[PDB]
Amino acid sequence: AAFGRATHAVVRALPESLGQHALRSAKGEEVDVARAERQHQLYVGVLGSKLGLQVVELPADESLPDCVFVEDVAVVCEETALITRPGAPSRRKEVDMMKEALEKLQLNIVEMKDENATLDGGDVLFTGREFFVGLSKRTNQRGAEILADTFKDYAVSTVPVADGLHLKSFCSMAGPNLIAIGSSESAQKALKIMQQMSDHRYDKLTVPDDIAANCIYLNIPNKGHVLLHRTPEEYPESAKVYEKLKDHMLIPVSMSELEKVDGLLTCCSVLINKK
Numbered sequence: 001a002a003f004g005r006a007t008h009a010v011v012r013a014l015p016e017s018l019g020q021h022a023l024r025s026a027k028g029e030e031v032d033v034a035r036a037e038r039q040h041q042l043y044v045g046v047l048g049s050k051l052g053l054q055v056v057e058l059p060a061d062e063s064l065p066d067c068v069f070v071e072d073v074a075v076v077c078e079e080t081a082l083i084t085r086p087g088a089p090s091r092r093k094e095v096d097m098m099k100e101a102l103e104k105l106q107l108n109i110v111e112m113k114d115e116n117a118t119l120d121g122g123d124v125l126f127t128g129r130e131f132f133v134g135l136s137k138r139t140n141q142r143g144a145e146i147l148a149d150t151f152k153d154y155a156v157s158t159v160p161v162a163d164g165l166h167l168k169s170f171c172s173m174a175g176p177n178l179i180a181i182g183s184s185e186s187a188q189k190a191l192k193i194m195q196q197m198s199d200h201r202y203d204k205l206t207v208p209d210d211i212a213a214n215c216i217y218l219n220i221p222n223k224g225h226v227l228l229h230r231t232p233e234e235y236p237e238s239a240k241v242y243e244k245l246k247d248h249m250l251i252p253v254s255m256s257e258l259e260k261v262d263g264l265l266t267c268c269s270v271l272i273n274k275k
Contacts, residue, residue, distance in 0.1 A: 025164030087138025119143025134167030182210030
């Protein structure tokens with residue numbers, strides 16, 4: 001029942017179409033789909049083969065270029081699964097498959113159907129004590145309200161998010177009561193708001209690179225603290241910070257290709273603790 005404990009991980013293979021057709025906040029360099037596929041395979045390998053989680057691998061759909069980013073279509077807390085209503089309308093076609101996978105895992109399902117509500121799972125940060133929902137271009141007040149009504153056992157606070165970012169584009173949980181946070185003006189502004197609204201102050205792990213603040217924390221049986229973070233090659237100054245977590249099993253995982261389409265570590269999986 002410790003924070004970060006998971007038994008299952010839902011992921012989805014990336015379609016070949018992702019390279020050219022996936023949505024992306026900024027125009028950048030060409031995506032190497034083969035490399036992206038390899039990095040995704042390694043990512044899944046860490047979750048399942050290395051850490052022992054049971055991985056449910058949903059099939060890619062060439063018509064859904066962004067389907068690999070399952071975090072945005074569902075938010076899971078304990079035995080409840082909130083099927084979201086993505087800010088990008090075309091991505092709402094990804095929802096039904098996740099829903100079916102979560103129902104198979106016996107989770108209590110709540111669907112966001114309100115035509116005036118939108119919410120990307122990537123704008124949701126569950127600290128284990130409460131929820132923080134980013135109000136952005138993808139997630140609106142109504143979506144936040146529905147999430148609050150879905151997880152009545154936890155407090156829900158919203159925080160302004162700018163540009164084409166998501167809340168977790170610059171933060172994520174790095175451990176119990178530990179928030180990994182970027183150093184940019186935006187990241188720090190958001191953190192101060194979250195700290196002020198909460199009934200309890202959180203410890204923080206500040207990294208120089210906002211994107212590198214997105215890591216995956218897991219509490220694994222017979223291993224304890226486990227953390228997947230961006231590599232020294234990708235963000236050396238940030239990797240140096242994670243290296244200071246002497247009680248965590250650090251695992252460097254690359255996402256250099258999917259990062260081109262705003263795909264970070266948390267974005268590629270939905271974690272579940274099925275007892």
